[PDB]
Amino acid sequence: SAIRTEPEIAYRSNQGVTRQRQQTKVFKLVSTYDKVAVKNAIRAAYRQVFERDLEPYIINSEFTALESKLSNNEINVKEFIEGLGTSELYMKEFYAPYPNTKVIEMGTKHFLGRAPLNQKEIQQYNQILASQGLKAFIGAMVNGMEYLQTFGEDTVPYRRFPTLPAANFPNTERLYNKLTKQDKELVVPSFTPVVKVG
């Protein structure tokens, strides 16, 4: 119906979920013989974990040992991602300048690819941060069931576009649509309970 003029043409051309869901590349380390593909997966892992290339934020590559083990294929991409998480660079750029709730947000963005699911997950990961630091936090969230059901042992994590539960997709959208160090506010501070127990 109607004449369908150019302003609303440009509106409805990008209408629903943005095309970045399909216009990406999933980095699966298929074989370690292709050293070029190994290097591509390693740089993609750097970009996924630290939201950008880590060239202006190193003296030299401190993960070169992890690159060597990954190229020799006695560690997997899951262990490479865990080694990136349990590193001084990740805590310098994502744990030192942020409160622990923001650390939960940025950690699940970089590692699980999506926003925190619920207040139960927030409480669990906050308890792990309060008790054992961030290394056990990264280890738990990487060795959890969801990481292996989505990515597995050979796939670099990517930005995910979930449907369930509620607010997970918009909080993921607002967590990924802002670029690095854009603001210090909390996209998902906590989920307000509809019923207060006691």
Q: Work out the burial of residue 32: count CB atoms within 10 Å of its CB; fewer than 13 is exposed, 13-18 middle, 19 or more buried.
A: middle
Residues 138-177 contacting another protein, CB under 8 A: 139-140, 143, 145, 148, 152-154, 163-167, 169-171, 173
- Residue 156 and residue 38 in contact, taking contact as beta carbons nearer than 8 Å: no
Closest CB 130 distance from ligand CYC, rounded Å: 7
Distance of CA 33 to the CA centre of its chain: 27
Which of 111, 116, 113 lies closest to 187, judged by CA?
116
1's contact among ligand CYC, another protein, none, with CB below 5 to 8 A by partner kind, is another protein
Q: Rule CB under 8 A: is residue 97 a binding residue for another protein?
A: yes
Residues 33-72 contacting another protein, CB under 8 A: 59-60, 62-65, 69
- Tell me the residue ranges of DSSP E strands in 127-187: none
Pick from 68, 99, 133, 178 the residue near another protein by CB under 8 A: 99
Q: Rule CB under 8 A: is residue 133 a binding residue for another protein?
A: no
Closest CB 154 distance from another protein, rounded Å: 4
Nearer to ligand CYC, 54 or 141 (CB): 141
- End-to-end CA separation in angstroms for the chain: 56
